[PDB]
Amino acid sequence: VNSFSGYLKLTDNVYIKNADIVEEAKKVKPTVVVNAANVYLKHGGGVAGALNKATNNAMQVESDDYIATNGPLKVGGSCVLSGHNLAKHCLHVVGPNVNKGEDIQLLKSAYENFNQHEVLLAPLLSAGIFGADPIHSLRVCVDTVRTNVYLAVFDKNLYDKLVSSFL
Ligand SMILES: Nc1cnc2ccccc2c1
C-alpha cells in the first residue's frame, strides 16, 4: 500500500491523475519525483520551472553545482539529486524536445530511467512545452516502465483525452 490517492489505474503498474505535480509532491512527499529536465538542468519553465519555483530556487542552485562538476546530461539520460521540500529525491530525466529537433525514439530511453526506482511521481516525458504528442508519451510510458509510476497531468482537458483514448 502507498499514499497516492485519486488515481485511475491504467495497467498493472501505471496510474494517472489530473493534478499539479507540485501540489501532489507537497502532499505525498514521495521517495522520487521526476523532473522534465533539459541537458543543462536550466529549470526555467514547464514542470522544471514549477518544481524549481516551489523549492525557492534551491533546485537550480544544486543543479548548477552538478553541471559545473559533471557537464550536461544526455538526451534520454538522467541524474538523481535532492527532492528538497517536495520529495526525498528528484530524478531529473531529459526527454527529447521536439521544438529543438531531437529524435523522438529517445523517449523510450528517457522512460527506461524510471525502472531504476520502485515507485515514482512523474509527468509525461516530452509532453507540454517539449512538443511531443502526450498520447504517444503515455503509450511509451506504459510499454517501457515496469516499476510503479503515478502520472500527474496538469491540463484537465488533456487528462480526459488521455484516459478516453487509452488502449
Ligand atoms: N503550477 C504549475 C505551473 N506550471 C506548470 C507547467 C507544466 C507542468 C506543471 C505546472 C504546474
Choose among 158, 156, 150, 148: nearest CA to 127. 158
> Which residue, by CA, sits nearest to atom 7 of ligand 1?
46
Determination technique used: X-ray
Cell of 115: 525502472
Into how many domains does the chain fold? 1
Domain that holds residue 115: 1-167
Ligand 1 centroid to 72 CA: how many Å?
24
Choose among 94, 140, 97, 92: nearest CA to 120. 92
Q: Is 134 in the pocket of ligand 1 (CB under 6 A)?
A: no
CB 29 within 8 A of CB 90: no
Distances (CA, A) of 138 to 81, 98, 119, 128, 166: 25, 16, 17, 12, 8
